[PDB]
Design a protein around this ligand. Sequence first.
Ligand SMILES: *[C@@H]1O[C@H](CO)[C@@H](O)[C@H](O)[C@H]1NC(C)=O
Ligand SMILES: *[C@@H]1O[C@H](CO)[C@@H](O)[C@H](O)[C@H]1NC(C)=O
Ligand SMILES: *[C@@H]1O[C@H](CO)[C@@H](O)[C@H](O)[C@H]1NC(C)=O
Ligand SMILES: *[C@@H]1O[C@H](CO)[C@@H](O)[C@H](O)[C@H]1NC(C)=O
Length: 609
Amino acid sequence: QYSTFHSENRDWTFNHLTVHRRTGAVYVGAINRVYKLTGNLTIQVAHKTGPEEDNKACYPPLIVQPCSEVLTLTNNVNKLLIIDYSENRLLACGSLYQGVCKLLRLDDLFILVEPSHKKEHYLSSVNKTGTMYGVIVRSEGEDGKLFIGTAVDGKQDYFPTLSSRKLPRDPESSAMLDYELHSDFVSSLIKIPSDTLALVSHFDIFYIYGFASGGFVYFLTVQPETPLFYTSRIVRLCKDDPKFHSYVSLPFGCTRAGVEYRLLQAAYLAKPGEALAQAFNISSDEDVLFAIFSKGQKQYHHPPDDSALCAFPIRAINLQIKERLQSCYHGEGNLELNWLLGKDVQCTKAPVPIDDNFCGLDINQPLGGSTPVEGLTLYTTSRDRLTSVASYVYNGYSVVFVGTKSGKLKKIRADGPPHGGVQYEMVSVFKDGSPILRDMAFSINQLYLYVMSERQVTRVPVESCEQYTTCGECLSSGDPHCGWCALHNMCSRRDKCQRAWEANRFAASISQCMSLEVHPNSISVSDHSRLLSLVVNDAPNLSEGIACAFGNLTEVEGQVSGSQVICISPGPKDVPVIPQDWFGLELQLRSKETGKIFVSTEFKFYNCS
Ligand SMILES: *[C@@H]1O[C@H](CO)[C@@H](O)[C@H](O)[C@H]1NC(C)=O
Ligand SMILES: *[C@@H]1O[C@H](CO)[C@@H](O)[C@H](O)[C@H]1NC(C)=O
Ligand SMILES: *[C@@H]1O[C@H](CO)[C@@H](O)[C@H](O)[C@H]1NC(C)=O
Ligand SMILES: *[C@@H]1O[C@H](CO)[C@@H](O)[C@H](O)[C@H]1NC(C)=O
């Protein structure tokens, strides 16, 4: 019974989702709509973005200059949704009018500005989802910039495939969304060459994901392989490089057991957790890129189910790039980036020191490479295709959530070789079997993960430990969230277990589970009302009081001293009725501190007659 929000319309489908880290406001980008919802997915405001009359042939767009073309009522696909944290704004870009963007207030989604007066304010007319990504970069003191990667719809001269645009703090800035750098010969953008479009029909580059880490930004792309096959790549730029000389692009993927997964589907940047940090030999607070790959390099449009979850430490990505740079600056081989260069170009040997933070020169760039960056494969399936990924760290454990094509959400505990991570739970989110989309986001305290299909957004609890009804089940579940709350007789998070910090109140390994011993273990029916001496192993304080329940029969107050409890057998009018020569029962202790029955052990009655 998860909180959920449905699309208002079978055709106004959901595209993107983001959650404000501080307010917990949920923003959903959808066709013709941007929604602001509460934590439990109740609408507080909905901004309408379409439909509107339009035509892709109107360039510049209708909103800028008159157009003679026949117009058609057109749906506005949300292509970009990013929170501009320092400025309390939401960036929302659609497919209408050659892809202008809006800046919206976070509180009421009211429009701040909609840049439309320059040609670079038109991001792209592509109206398919999952082909564009952006990353905002702004340090304290800096005005701000926005890196955008996008498919260009074969309009290579209208729209850069990747570029940097100004994103000033002042919404009214006369420079809003201009190119960071524009010169006759040098600008802060990459254009797809006509040559490449000529070589490959409907060639385009799809931007699956993007993130900032350290001094760089990273974009993850899929595109047709220039002489079908696709290549998934990591693209890196220095954060401060208006000339784009730092451009480096390397293929990536992963393998396991003769199977190659080289077709990128989804990705998410997070911390490693202790196991992965060890495996990668990095520090706990260093970044790791988690990714979903489909089998092979073919069939981009119709992937098989065979897919994998893979992890790439940012450190290894940077290292392999630095070494590529050093090899190239030593004069070895060529730049190897045919799609962008249009020919083989030799690496230039030059007396230039390359450090971790090398930001390029006008030689040896843009830089490519044929050797893939290999990730650590964590999990594979051949059954239900993996479609999404999010991850965080709980108590030093990496918990990776992976959505599927049939609306399942897998919960995977990560560790390195041998053969980790491990799926400890799978949950059905969408009963109609709809694919889970790429965008997932956590609530403010990582209590929930918000997950979306085309027609639904659902708030999914990160854990449901209480589904485990014994200490044994609880602590053998594999779920890093779950421990056994001793006195409340329940499986929960440490933080959900009152006085968990007190001795033996919270069990974190199957070993700490309480056991009960009775002395003696059995009595004769003719021996009613006898004093039994009980011992509770691994007990917390019981001095608050203990009652003794002999099954459904009686319940008496017990005598407490440390972890020992004295209780009196039931009287003659309560001694059970033997079938057999013996009648079994369950002697249970009740905590007066909590009111809950929390342990029991078998107790026997007999009749030697
Ligand atoms: C969700 O939040 C709203 C606040 O507007 C509240 O009225 C509603 O009861 C909540 N829904 C739940 C948790 O059932
Ligand atoms: C999206 O744009 C394409 C242009 O190639 C068009 O053919 C298609 O009908 C559009 N789909 C909509 C209206 O969402
Ligand atoms: C792991 O890192 C440490 C320093 O951080 C280094 O000494 C060691 O060589 C590395 N482990 C390997 C590669 O065996
Ligand atoms: C014991 O009592 C329980 C409910 O307290 C009842 O369901 C059960 O039938 C009883 N067992 C007997 C009478 O043996």
